[PDB]
Amino acid sequence: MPNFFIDRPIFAWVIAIIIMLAGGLAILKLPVAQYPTIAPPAVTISASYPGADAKTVQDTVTQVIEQNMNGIDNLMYMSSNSDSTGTVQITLTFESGTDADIAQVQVQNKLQLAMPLLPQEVQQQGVSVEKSSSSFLMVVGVINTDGTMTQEDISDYVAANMKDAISRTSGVGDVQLFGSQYAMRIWMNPNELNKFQLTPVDVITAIKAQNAQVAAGQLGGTPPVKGQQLNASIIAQTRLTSTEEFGKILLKVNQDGSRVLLRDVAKIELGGENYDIIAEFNGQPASGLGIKLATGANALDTAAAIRAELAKMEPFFPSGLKIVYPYDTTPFVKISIHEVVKTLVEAIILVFLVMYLFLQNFRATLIPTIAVPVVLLGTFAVLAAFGFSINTLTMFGMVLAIGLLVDDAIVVVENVERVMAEEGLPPKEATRKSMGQIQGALVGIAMVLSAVFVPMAFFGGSTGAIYRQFSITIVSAMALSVLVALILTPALCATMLKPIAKGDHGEGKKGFFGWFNRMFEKSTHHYTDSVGGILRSTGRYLVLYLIIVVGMAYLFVRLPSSFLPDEDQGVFMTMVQLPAGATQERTQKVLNEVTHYYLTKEKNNVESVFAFNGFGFAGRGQNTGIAFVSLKDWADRPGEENKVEAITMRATRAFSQIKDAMVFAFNLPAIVELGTATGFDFELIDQAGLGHEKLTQARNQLLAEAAKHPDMLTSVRPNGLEDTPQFKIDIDQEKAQALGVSINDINTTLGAAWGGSYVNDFIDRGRVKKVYVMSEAKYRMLPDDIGDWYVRAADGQMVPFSAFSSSRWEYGSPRLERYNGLPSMEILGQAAPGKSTGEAMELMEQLASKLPTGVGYDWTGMSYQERLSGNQAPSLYAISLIVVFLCLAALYESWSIPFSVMLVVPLGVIGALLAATFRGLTNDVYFQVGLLTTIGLSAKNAILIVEFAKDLMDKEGKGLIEATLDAVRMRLRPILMTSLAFILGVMPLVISTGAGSGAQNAVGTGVMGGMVTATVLAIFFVPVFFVVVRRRF
């Protein structure tokens, strides 16, 4: 096939041109993202049951729903929780790769079995199932610049005029509203109601009759009488619109003709729907949107559309409104992609400089260079066909390939150059002779290098998703490289190589060239003399091989394990928790302290602080808070002391002095779709019916012991609220019937006054908004306030609420969690600095072993993937070695040769482990790629010797010692040139220190150590192994 294109040079360029432009068009259409879809899909269920406590809700709603959820396809684990507000959340996580839409249908199909069994209050409220994620894509904040309008005014304008428009765009999956739409609030005064002999029941009935909308028939009608000439619609009572109209509602007319109106026994005010969430931005009132992208949508494209949309409606804002972006992750994605591209263009320059160093003229060193753009652009076309997307993982694939694919053209160009010097053959004739003796060598390298990366792509789990990106890039690049080297290089090099004098070695060359050649050639002569004494006796060097194998085993078991590393994304979060029973005001005081510290001590780094009150993780409550912190640009934060890890370490050590509060700060996880914070995630699960109180004692015992080892465990904290007192009133219906008071009136009066009620809806500028009834704030703050209310009896007299009721105090947990249908409690924390998450996970299993009988443990979220990843690691290596062994056996018809090559692999692995230990890295997902790559390139060096000696053996009849020496003497030059090119190729990755450099360091360091020993040591042991195996057979 190569001989076909030597006589057809113009045809050869056509293939290269077509591939080059095909990749270019694919670049203009491929999507861009930081990572592929590696998170497993999740489906959530929401429900409500107002008025019920946490314990009642779990046994009546949560337990029933989860009982019927067994038997779904590809179910990983299920978790749920309930709280005192009556809300229920059940989340199911499916295996990675499962279609979300099919799973969402399946869970909805099964849920309908248990729907009628739920209380009718739950059915009327309504339940829903939908896909969900645990993190926001971005947060858009709205503030008022002049402070002319309050907090709820900001929220309503966004809710009524902004929120619906955003969701009408593509990519958006769900939007969270930090506030509430307007709603007509009526604050009753219990003293005024008692004076006019009225009850909240009378107010409720009056509103429902004075604020309704009814229909009526058409005046013309159908069927019509003969000759009717008109047709019109009758209009009747309609809904009210303004607060001035609500003041006209008539409650009761006195016997003397006096009238009492709703304006006279209550304050009519337009306000919010819920007051349990208070937001603040840099100490100013604000409201905002929590927007999360839909499953399968592009992150960058969605963000670009959102920013465009806000520009559309911005000019129509009322004076004093502006948009703020306190939380965003897209700038990190933009920077990370740009950094790697800069790294890639730096690596290709380094490779070119190495090529020119070996005495080569300018015209010669070009020949292998044109292959680089072709294979890279050709790789992009393959990605487009299969539907992949450009990402950081695919970025690393070709970066490793740049220093690994050039050798295909190097062998051809170097060998024909040697033929020119040794024989003085004409260029066209010499090229027609060179490819005959290297054709098997070329296909061998590509076929071996593709062998390691093929079996890795079939593994499942989130780890398998990472693996597929590397395999598709390396294999496609390798297949293209052998093609382009065989199809293009011999044709172009056939005529490009100008005549060269026979025997010329560049003795009089200028510069370093005049000295470099003499030293290299002299070193080559010395090397063969050194090798000659090696074959004299193999006993000594065989012993040294054993000590290396033992040495690498010792290093392997000492390396700590971990999952994907974390990067300074420019944003981190702070969590605040207070003791049980803390009011909203007390929490606000602490949040002022935490927001005052950042803007005074860390003013050089932080930019803005977005604080929430009431909302937060581990359930909603008045004693919980959260704050988002956004840092400045990376270019304005020099050094390491101004990074996220350094800042958050100093913050926690300073907030520990806050009395009567728990404050922590932490970085976001590696991927924000599984967990809310970095580090492990530990679940303590009861599995023997111990009971809630006994389970709590075990949890306290475990974390108390964990506090005894601060040097490996830090920031250990529960993820649930503590026990709180409850105030329950006992109603005596026996006395109620004696006095003549309806039970419904008592229940309605208590519920409406203290908890509020929803009555009707009214029209506000064309919208539809709720109407609520509540007692005034200063009448429902103390237990003694119940003595002020009254209820009307059938006789017409007032009776105090204390005449037939009594109260007492109780205790009860405000939140309960369940794991896989069993009661459980969550524990969170972080590893100590200098340690690894693997060490922390190992330590806790030892601590959990001393727990009382009947309680177990299980990992979830972030930790679950790490446990799964480490279990399947041994299987990955075993399969790869078997495929390589069989692959080599096809290429040479002998079992002996693969044994010789295989024994070189340990010499390559020891290099990676030694490099990792010096840099203090951890055996993680990226390290797995390095070891697999180390297998391929270690065997690549051994191939260039064993194949050349074999041909010189059976085709020339040379002796075994003679054949081994000849191959080493002639193949020394290509080995050094290729290995040096690869080493300088990954130079930028190791030395990189910019944004997102943690991931680059892990990939580069592991492979870097492998090459060094795979060249220095293998160039000695390969002759030994080849002789020993051949002698045995």
Curated annotation (Swiss-Prot):
It is a multi-pass membrane protein. The chain crosses the membrane at residues 10-28, 337-356, 366-385, 392-413, 439-457, 466-490, 539-555, 872-888, 899-918, 925-943, 973-992, 999-1018. PANTHER family: MULTIDRUG EFFLUX PUMP SUBUNIT ACRB-RELATED, PTHR32063. It holds the Pfam family ACR_tran. Induction: Positively regulated by MarA, Rob and SoxS transcriptional regulators (at protein level). One of its GO terms (cellular component) is plasma membrane. Disruption phenotype: Loss of susceptibility to contact-dependent growth inhibition (CDI); inhibiting cells still contact the target. Keywords: Cell inner membrane, Cell membrane, Membrane, Transmembrane, Transmembrane helix, Transport. Belongs to the resistance-nodulation-cell division (RND) (TC 2.A.6) family. InterPro entries: AcrB_DN_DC_subdom, Acrflvin-R, MdtF-like. One of its GO terms (molecular function) is bile acid transmembrane transporter activity. It is found in: Cell inner membrane. Homotrimer, with large domains that extend into the periplasm, interacts with AcrA and TolC. AcrA may be required to stably link this protein and TolC. Interacts with AcrZ. Part of the AcrA-AcrB-AcrZ-TolC efflux pump. Changing residue 526 to Y: Partially restores chloramphenicol resistance to an AcrZ G30R mutant. Residues 1-9, 357-365, 414-438, 491-538, 889-898, 944-972 are cytoplasmic. GO terms for biological process: alkane transport; bile acid and bile salt transport; enterobactin transport; fatty acid transport; response to antibiotic; response to toxic substance; response to xenobiotic stimulus; xenobiotic detoxification by transmembrane export across the cell outer membrane. This is Multidrug efflux pump subunit AcrB. The gene is acrB. Gene3D superfamilies: Multidrug efflux transporter AcrB pore domain, Multidrug efflux transporter AcrB pore domain like, Multidrug efflux transporter AcrB TolC docking domain, DN and DC subdomains, Multidrug efflux transporter AcrB transmembrane domain. AcrA-AcrB-AcrZ-TolC is a drug efflux protein complex with broad substrate specificity that uses the proton motive force to export substrates. (Microbial infection) Involved in contact-dependent growth inhibition (CDI), acts downstream of BamA, the receptor for CDI. Its role in CDI is independent of the AcrA-AcrB-TolC efflux pump complex. Residues 29-336, 386-391, 458-465, 556-871, 919-924, 993-998 are periplasmic. It comes from Escherichia coli (strain K12).
